[PDB]
Amino acid sequence: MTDRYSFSLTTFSPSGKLGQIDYALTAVKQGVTSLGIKATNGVVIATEKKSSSPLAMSETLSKVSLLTPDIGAVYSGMGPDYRVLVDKSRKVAHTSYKRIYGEYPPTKLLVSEVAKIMQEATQSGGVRPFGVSLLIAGHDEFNGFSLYQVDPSGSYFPWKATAIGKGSVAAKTFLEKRWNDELELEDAIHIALLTLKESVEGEFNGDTIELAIIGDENPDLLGYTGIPTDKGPRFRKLTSQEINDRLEAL
Amino acid sequence: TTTLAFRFQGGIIVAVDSRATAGNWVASQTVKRVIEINPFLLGTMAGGAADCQFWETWLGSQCRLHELREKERISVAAASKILSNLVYQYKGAGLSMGTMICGYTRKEGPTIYYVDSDGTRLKGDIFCVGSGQTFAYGVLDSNYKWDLSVEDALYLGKRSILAAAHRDAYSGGSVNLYHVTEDGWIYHGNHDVGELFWKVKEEEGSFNNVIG
Amino acid sequence: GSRRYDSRTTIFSPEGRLYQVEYALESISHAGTAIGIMASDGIVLAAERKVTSTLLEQDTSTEKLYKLNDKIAVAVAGLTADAEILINTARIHAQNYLKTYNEDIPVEILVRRLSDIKQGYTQHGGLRPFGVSFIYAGYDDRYGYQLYTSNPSGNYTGWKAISVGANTSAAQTLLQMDYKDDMKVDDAIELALKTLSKTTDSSALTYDRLEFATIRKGANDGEVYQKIFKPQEIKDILVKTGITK
Amino acid sequence: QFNPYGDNGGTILGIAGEDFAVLAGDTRNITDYSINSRYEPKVFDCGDNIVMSANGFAADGDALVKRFKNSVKWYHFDHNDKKLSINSAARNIQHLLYGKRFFPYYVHTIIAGLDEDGKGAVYSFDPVGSYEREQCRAGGAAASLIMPFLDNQVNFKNQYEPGTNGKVKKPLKYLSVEEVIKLVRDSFTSATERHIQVGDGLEILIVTKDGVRKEFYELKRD
Amino acid sequence: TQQPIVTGTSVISMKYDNGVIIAADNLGSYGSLLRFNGVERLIPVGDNTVVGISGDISDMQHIERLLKDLVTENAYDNPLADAEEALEPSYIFEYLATVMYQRRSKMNPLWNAIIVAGVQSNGDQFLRYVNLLGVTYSSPTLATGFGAHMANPLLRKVVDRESDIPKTTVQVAEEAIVNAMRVLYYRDARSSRNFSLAIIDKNTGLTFKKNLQVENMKWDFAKDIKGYGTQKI
Amino acid sequence: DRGVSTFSPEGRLFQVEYSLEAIKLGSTAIGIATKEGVVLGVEKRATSPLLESDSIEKIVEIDRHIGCAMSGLTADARSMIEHARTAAVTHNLYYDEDINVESLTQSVCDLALRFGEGASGEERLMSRPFGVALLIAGHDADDGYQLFHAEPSGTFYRYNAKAIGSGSEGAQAELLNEWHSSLTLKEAELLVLKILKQVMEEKLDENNAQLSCITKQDGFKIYDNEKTAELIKELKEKEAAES
Amino acid sequence: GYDRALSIFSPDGHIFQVEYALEAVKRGTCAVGVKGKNCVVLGCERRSTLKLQDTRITPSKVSKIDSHVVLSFSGLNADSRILIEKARVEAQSHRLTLEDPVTVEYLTRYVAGVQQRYTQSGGVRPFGVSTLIAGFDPRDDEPKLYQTEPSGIYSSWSAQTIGRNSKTVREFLEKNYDRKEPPATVEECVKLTVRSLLEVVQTGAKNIEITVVKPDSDIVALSSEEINQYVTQIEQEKQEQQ
Amino acid sequence: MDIILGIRVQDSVILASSKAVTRGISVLKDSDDKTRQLSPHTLMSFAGEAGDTVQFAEYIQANIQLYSIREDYELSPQAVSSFVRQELAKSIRSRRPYQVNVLIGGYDKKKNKPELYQIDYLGTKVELPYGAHGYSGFYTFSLLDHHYRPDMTTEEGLDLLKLCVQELEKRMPMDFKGVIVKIVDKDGIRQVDDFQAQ
């Protein structure tokens, strides 16, 4: 009685592929257009906000989560897989670093920690592997601003701009052409709305874009108005009005 | 308790007391003091009685099991080293053992290993172990001679026990003699200390050159 | 239960093979290339990053070069993910040898462990194995410079020139000819780059499609100092050989 | 705080004879000066010509016995009703005794019966393990008083016939069941006077190949 | 471990020819403060066993639950069971004893002392004692707590051998129990003025008179007044 | 793979049936218990100059009063022996005496039941049942000389003689005719050699046969190469003079 | 739980998984042991086709199990490490506990025992390796040669050969050895061993590795130089018997 | 305890270890030696509690000997001293430590330098040109420092060690009846039979 399932559910096929990773990727291709840009004077990430219903809050909805204070992530794939994964990433990041080295994990180090979760899950049976791909966009004061891709298997590679979801390749073409480093964060926000207007047609607004930047400070993001002791967050998610203001700014 | 073994030309002479008491009055002259491991191996009861009773019979079983397993006679050495590993684990929680593992094997000859509660393992050629050890060794030593025949050898073993029995109140009911030979051990009887004392006093002249 | 809800692919085959292992080598043969040239004053290491872009960083040149020690490093051919678990555990296996005896692990011990963990995933558990092949770039004072490759099957072999990844076949056919049995680093660098161009299709050989590391004895750097070449030092060596074409 | 361990008195006596053996015990059970029982069988038949008494502390007796009663049952099942030998039973007890010593035991156990080659046998135990075979064994609180007579008259030790008393002696005769019972009644009648741990009743179980035979002699009541 | 803070004292018993009698005060002490007066400490377990428990109340409460579960588990396997394979005095006592021995052997002990009295419905009288030390014994008279000391020598004049058991009647038996208890209240003040007393009959099953009170009052102390508050300056 | 709890319409498990298939492929083991001993004989078989043929035997001692000869897979009979030694040793320590051959077979048969996925009754740790059947022969002081056939299925029967192996169908048939209730140890051993000769396609040598015996002044005793050959020498001449 | 089945019966009374284990050994390299009455010779292939191997850190086929005992094999290296490790531990376990140098028979029982376990026990498969175990018992000058299969069975053999073209090397050896007159001198027993193993390696005289074991820890591996010399000689012998 | 001295001279590493067990007047045994060969050029001598001694000694021996066959390589005396230390420093937390103080005397065949390691039961390992444990060192350090200063041969060490042992048995009231001396150098391990003035 009870489970006995310990046989791996991810297995090799005659070609050298892994059935479960192939499947999972189809889901990711069909998922919501997300991109990431390093502006060099920041990092701007944008993703599609969506609504389920007009009578539905989209405050609760999670399309951009802060993994650690200076770092945000966005994705294309399977929403439920994303939500749990964010949780295990937040937990280990807090317990194992935030009073051990006395600060957040470096971006590359955090990409490896995610990578490991996904790989445990691919090796081991009882459970199928995560079906997701992430774009982890970040700042760490020992590497600047970074952009990574995290694949479903947990393969990762460095990027300085990319897009995943539906309609990626052409989105990368517009981004490649418009930005080539040394660019204001504001300007990268403008370029990003332009790339996505061409990418999404039928109805387009800044109330269907959810935009976050890592690329600012306020005293409010030290979390106190007194005498500094540390630097604190640089994650800031914008409200819908601010985004419409940048849509009005040519 | 004074329990002894020596290796000599003829083999090994194992000489021991037997004595159980209710007060100081010796209730019975018979207590266990020799634990029979196997037909050629002796181990002595002393120290933790219970620890000795259980673990030397146990030892006998595991030895019998080796003779099936590997089809070889055991060493006295192999026997001791097993005992010691187990003894050290149960230390600090109790467990007390005082034994000498004595045997005469074809693959070593007459061989004696000393084994205690703390896990020492020592080989020697002459032992007395006990609390009457120092006196008993005196008697043993001045008439020791490796070359010597079994008959004399036995009477000397016995005299060391009586000498010990008289000063200390932890031996002397009767004296049990065993000769461990190549082909197994041979009992040589229980000697009444009462008849034995009178003979020895006149005869040896040791602590008794001028009788006292 | 799980009997008719699972299968057994970790069993043998009517040739003596294991399904997943044979297949694992296939996965490796279309992954990016790693090359190992052992010299006798150094180790020269080259890797091709297949496909590079101006949207990927080409700036990170540890992407397939990882140091497992300051005396042993591997070059990876297969997946980043598969790689990560054996690296982290290998680095840990190091520290244990180092703590116990106050001396670094030889290459050979560390390989034999790795291989036993990899064999283990097909040997019990029902699990799947890794799909990444390692080239060990390494040191001993018993064996000089050492060059190994180990596979998901857990067989390991001693080398002084080896390749795994794609285009293995082309690199090794040129390399065996142009090899000199005892040679300096700089000579090795000339030989490597020469081989490299003609294993990379058309005009493509660039500094920023390459990862290069060399392990030299030095005399302003310490004995067995591993230099993992960052872009700019690749640019230099290409111009010196003149091979950029 | 707590240690339940004390004493509960009582006295048992085992004698190996020529073909037979006895386990005699008084039937008085105490805790200090109070009477727990004035009849409570203090020799009990465990079966197989084996009769058994754990004198000392009661609380350990009851436990020792229950562990052992289930072993008599399991030996039979697992080996098709092959009856338990006095020597084998003695080994089985050794292991029981030795099994607790982190909670140590304070009993003097004695078993009596016949061995399977037909000689009366009595075995005496030390409270945390060990047994050895003896010819005669007085046990319990009043062990120390009973043994010095017993040694003369049964065992012919520290007993010599008026002459020189040193090359002339009184010799060993294995006693009869009648002659043993006289001795045992005499021991116990003297014992009652001197010990408040002996009295009330005397149960002698005499053990023969015709079974276990019960005898009852009366003793002193306050 | 533990040492007392809460006590109950004194449960006394005897055999007669065709039953048993047991009587006990009803008490939860906090020392010498009679805190709970009325606490059950004869627990009828069926109609043929009464369990008397003396000692620590904290321990007594736990056994009190355990006995009430034994009835519920005795209705399991057949509901009309009461001499078929459940509900006999020997069963209730052996059960208690196995727990009693285990707890002391690990030294975190049940700090009670128990008297199981009943009349088997298959046999004759049952009377057996068990304490915290793991000593257990049987006798025709038994008492725990103070009553072991003081009541039990009174009991022994009526019955204390087998032979004296047919020669004691319900009336003779009841007179000894009523005498003994009067003694217990007189020389020891812990014992509550209210008691419950039960007579367990072959002839008429279980008769339990609850909440009976000491009577045939002593006021003997009045003879010995040499004053203790009667002051004249 | 294949069910571990899935029975035939009769109600005989697949795994049990498959157990019976490996047994039938070993070399014969034949026992006759007599009133002075138990004889166990095996065909060891194979003779080669690149083979040490008198270093391998199929008659292994469990105890100073218990042997077993086997037939079927030999690798399997090693796990059975490891369990059996441990159980016998622990019983000699507790009660000082011989363990019963029937008792031993039941203790072993209990661990023959595990195979497959686990139960909630039992923790099934193995993968197949054992593919060897055994003739365990012994002595006890309470039933004398005995001979037992343990099947890996669970069933164990006491016999006065039984053959197992490939060539058992013929062998058993001969055993009955030769068997009588005044048979002795010395006759039984000669007869074993007759049976073995008959069914061989070779000359009977002691590098293809091994004898063993039980006498209660020596326990389980291997009839050695030197003695077994002397017995073979005596056979060949006497047979070859009845022709 | 992964204690459930992974090795099942055949209907023929074999085991599928043991039949498939033996195939991996055959595809493999060849190892041989030939006995004198003074030595036991072990030949092991090292057929390096490619010249880009560095062969002082290319694995060997000879392990110490003990100072007077060797193990050689033919089969997957990966599996063979796992068996080799458990066998070294067992030699030291005896040494520690019995105060006695190790006897060859018990070690063989041990090597047999782990492989035997993994066929019988669930959620494990047997090793891909057959072995030869040889050495000398203590204070003993007579040779010992054992063969174990990953079935877990075991035997002694006067000589045995394994791996690829086992048939060919048995068949040859059978004509050049008798138990009644086996070789006394190292040179001629080695000559025979090199000659059998020449005939299956193809070209080899540096690709053949000989290690000759004399009583109690005199274990010496003959070199290329020496081997090239015996091959010359064999080319002289084959035109003296023409 | 057990008086165990070590002196590292120029050509070899000399360890001195007690030779007898004295019960009363007379030596019951005077054939004692307590040392174990770890490897042919790594030696460990031992002092402490007599049952903690054999139990540790065979435990450490077994592990290092498993590494020797496995790798078919001899390990350094440095390698062994780090190993011995770590293992002591796990047990000193535990509730039944060993109470064994060791000296491991080795010739590092791989540096070609002599090395002497003194290791406390605590796990305090120190490399020294001479050392002692306990109350011994008060009498013998005062000679060793004055009369001896580094860079002295094998012959010189022999005489020095004799002088030391004679003062310990007179003036210090511990009795252990002299030492029998062993030398660990390049060519392995010999026991120096003589003890008349060496």
| Nearest Cβ partner for G27 among C3, C16, C162 | C16
Tokens of H19: 């030779």
CA distance linking residue F145 with residue F65, whole number of Å? 10
CA distance linking residue H25 with residue H70, whole number of Å? 49
Residue C181 forms contact with G (CB below 8 Å): no
For residues G185 and G107, the answer to whether their CB atoms sit within 8 Å is no
- Contact list, B93 vs chain D (CB under 8 Å): 102
Q: How far is C122 from chain F (nearest CA, A)?
A: 17
CA distance linking residue F103 with residue D79, whole number of Å? 7
CA distance linking residue H144 with residue H151, whole number of Å? 13
- The contacts of residue G196 (CB under 8 Å, 6+ apart) are G32, G34, G43, G161, G169, G172, G173
Residue E193 per-residue DSSP state:
S
Helices marked H in chain E: 57-74, 89-105, 145-150, 152-155, 170-187
Amino acid G221 reads A
Ranges of beta strands (E only) in F44-130 are 59-63, 66-72
Residue whose tokens read 């435990």: H59
Tokens of H197: 């003035």
For residues C23 and A14, the answer to whether their CB atoms sit within 8 Å is yes
Amino acid H82 reads S
- Taking CB atoms and an 8 Å limit, are H29 and B124 in contact across chains? yes
Strand partners, C157: C149
C-alpha dihedral over A122, A124, A130, A133, to 10 degrees?
Answer: -30
Residue E117: domain span: 1-233
What is the pairing mode between strands D34-37 and D29-31? antiparallel
Distance of CA H105 to CAs B208, H66, H80, H141, Å? 52, 20, 11, 19
CA distance linking residue F150 with residue F153, whole number of Å? 8
**Domains, chain F, with CATH or none:** 1-242 (3.60.20.10)
Helix, strand or coil, per DSSP, at residue G74: strand
Nearest residue to D182 via CA among D144, D158, D209, D215: D215
Instruction: DSSP for chain D, please give it.
Output: ----------EEEEEE-SS-EEEEEE--EEETTEEEES---SSEEEETTEEEEEEE-HHHHHHHHHHHHHHHHHHHHHTTT-PPPHHHHHHHHHHHHHH--SS---EEEEEEEE-TTS-EEEEEEETTEEEEEESEEEEETTHHHHHHHHHHHTS--S---TTTSSSS-----PPPHHHHHHHHHHHHHHHHHH-SSS-SEEEEEEEETTEEEEEEEE----
Nearest residue to F51 via CA among F207, F226, F209: F207
CA distance linking residue C58 with residue E50, whole number of Å? 89
CA distance linking residue B73 with residue B87, whole number of Å? 23
**Longest pairwise C-alpha distance within chain C:** 66
Nearest residue to H105 via CA among H35, H11, H14: H14
Nearest residue to B128 via CA among B10, B15, B12, B212: B15
Tokens of G189: 């027993």
CA distance linking residue E52 with residue E92, whole number of Å? 12
Strand partners, E142: E13
Whichever domain contains G50, its CATH number is: 3.60.20.10
Residue G46 forms contact with C (CB below 8 Å): no
What number of CA atoms fall less than 13 Å from residue A33's CA on the CB side?
A: 21
Strand order in the sheet with C34-38: C161-164, C34-38, C42-48, C210-216, C225-228
G184: alpha, beta or left? (left if phi > 0; alpha if psi -120 to 50): alpha
Tokens of E176: 């000894």
For residues C224 and C107, the answer to whether their CB atoms sit within 8 Å is no
Q: Residue G184, exposed/middle/buried by CB under 10 A (0-12, 13-18, 19+)?
A: exposed
Residue A174 forms contact with C (CB below 8 Å): no
Strand order in the sheet with D21-26: D136-140, D11-16, D21-26, D201-208, D211-218
Neighbours of chain C (3+ CB pairs under 8 A): A, F, G, H
**Inter-helix orientation angle A79-95/A107-123, to 10°:** 120
Residue D209 CB neighbours (<10 A)? 9
Please work out, in degrees rounded to the nearest 5, the angle formed at the alpha carbon of residue C80 by the alpha carbons of C76 and C82.
90
Residue C131 per-residue DSSP state:
-
Helix (H) or strand (E) holding G148: strand G144-148
Residue G71: domain span: 1-240
CA distance linking residue F229 with residue E98, whole number of Å? 65
Classify the C-alpha dihedral H107-H110-H112-H117 as positive or negative: negative
Where along chain D do its domains lie? Answer: 1-222
Residue whose tokens read 């008490």: E27
- Taking CB atoms and an 8 Å limit, are C109 and H71 in contact across chains? yes
Nearest residue to D17 via CA among D142, D113, D145, D88: D113
Chains B and C touch (3+ CB pairs under 8 A): no
CA distance linking residue D43 with residue B186, whole number of Å? 39
Q: Which listed CATH number (3.30.70.1140, 3.40.50.720, 3.60.20.10, 3.30.2310.20) goes with C1-244?
A: 3.60.20.10
Whether E1 is catalytic: yes
Tokens of F9: 């319409």
Where along chain C do its domains lie? Answer: 1-244
Nearest residue to F4 via CA among F121, F147, F166, F117: F117
| Nearest Cβ partner for D6 among E1, E133, E161 | E133
Q: Alpha carbon B182 to chain centroid distance?
A: 17
- Taking CB atoms and an 8 Å limit, are D80 and F96 in contact across chains? no
- Look up the CATH superfamily of D1-222: Aminohydrolase, N-terminal nucleophile (Ntn) domain (3.60.20.10)
Please work out, in degrees rounded to the nearest 5, the angle formed at the alpha carbon of residue A130 by the alpha carbons of A125 and A136.
145
Q: How was this structure determined?
A: cryo-EM
Strand order in the sheet with A71-77: A65-68, A71-77, A132-140, A144-150, A156-159
C-alpha dihedral over G7, G10, G13, G18, to 10 degrees?
Answer: -50
CA distance linking residue E93 with residue A209, whole number of Å? 77
Distance of CA F218 to CAs D47, F227, H108, Å? 33, 16, 58
What number of CA atoms fall less than 13 Å from residue G113's CA on the CB side?
A: 14
CA distance linking residue E134 with residue D31, whole number of Å? 12
For residues G141 and G125, the answer to whether their CB atoms sit within 8 Å is no
First-to-last CA distance in chain G?
67
Distance of CA A210 to CAs A45, A192, A236, F86, G48, Å? 9, 12, 12, 71, 63
C-alpha dihedral over G164, G165, G171, G175, to 10 degrees?
Answer: -70
Length of chain C: 245
- Provide the number of structural domains found in chain E: 1
For residues A231 and A224, the answer to whether their CB atoms sit within 8 Å is no
Residue C185 CB neighbours (<10 A)? 18
Tokens of A244: 């419409």
Nearest residue to C38 via CA among C148, C152, C155, C116: C148
Residue C85 forms contact with A (CB below 8 Å): yes
For residues D72 and D46, the answer to whether their CB atoms sit within 8 Å is yes
Residue G159 forms contact with F (CB below 8 Å): yes
- The contacts of residue G86 (CB under 8 Å, 6+ apart) are G110, G114
First-to-last CA distance in chain D?
35
- Provide the number of structural domains found in chain H: 1
CA distance linking residue F122 with residue A68, whole number of Å? 49
Residue H108: domain span: 1-195
Tokens of B100: 């000498």
With b for 16 or more beta-carbon neighbours within 10 A and e for fewer, the H51-66 pattern comes to bbbbbbbbebbeebbb
First-to-last CA distance in chain E?
55
Residue whose tokens read 């701007």: A44
Q: How far is G44 from chain B (nearest CA, A)?
A: 30
For residues F63 and F220, the answer to whether their CB atoms sit within 8 Å is yes
B49 labelled binding-site residue: yes
Helix, strand or coil, per DSSP, at residue G210: strand
Tokens of C37: 């040239």
- Contact list, H70 vs chain G (CB under 8 Å): 64, 85, 88
With b for 16 or more beta-carbon neighbours within 10 A and e for fewer, the D38-47 pattern comes to bbbebbbbbe
For residues D93 and D131, the answer to whether their CB atoms sit within 8 Å is yes
Nearest residue to G178 via CA among F50, F46, F205, F206: F50
Dihedrals phi, psi of A186, to nearest 5 degrees: -50, -50
For residues D132 and D161, the answer to whether their CB atoms sit within 8 Å is no
Tokens of C26: 């296939």
- The contacts of residue B68 (CB under 8 Å, 6+ apart) are F61, F62, F63, F85
Instruction: DSSP for E106-130, please give it.
Output: TT----EEEEEEEE-SSSSEEEEEE
- The contacts of residue A207 (CB under 8 Å, 6+ apart) are A49, A240, A243, A244
First-to-last CA distance in chain C?
61
Nearest residue to F161 via CA among F174, F151, F152: F174
Amino acid F139 reads H
With b for 16 or more beta-carbon neighbours within 10 A and e for fewer, the A142-156 pattern comes to eeebbbbbbbbbbbb
Helix, strand or coil, per DSSP, at residue F117: coil
Dihedrals phi, psi of H7, to nearest 5 degrees: -140, 135
Helix (H) or strand (E) holding B104: strand B98-105
**Domains, chain A, with CATH or none:** 1-249 (3.60.20.10)
Q: Residue B207, exposed/middle/buried by CB under 10 A (0-12, 13-18, 19+)?
A: middle
Nearest residue to A76 via CA among A161, A16, A164: A164
| Nearest Cβ partner for H62 among G64, G67, G92 | G92
Classify the C-alpha dihedral C189-C192-C195-C201 as positive or negative: negative
CA distance linking residue C243 with residue D57, whole number of Å? 99
- Taking CB atoms and an 8 Å limit, are H78 and C102 in contact across chains? yes
- Taking CB atoms and an 8 Å limit, are B93 and D102 in contact across chains? yes
Counts for chain H of helices (H) and strands (E), in that order? 4, 12
| Nearest Cβ partner for F94 among D80, D82, D95 | D95
For residues C111 and C150, the answer to whether their CB atoms sit within 8 Å is yes
CA distance linking residue C130 with residue C137, whole number of Å? 20
For residues G201 and G49, the answer to whether their CB atoms sit within 8 Å is no
Alpha-carbon Rg for chain G, nearest whole angstrom, is: 19
Helix, strand or coil, per DSSP, at residue A143: coil
Classify the C-alpha dihedral E71-E74-E76-E82 as positive or negative: negative
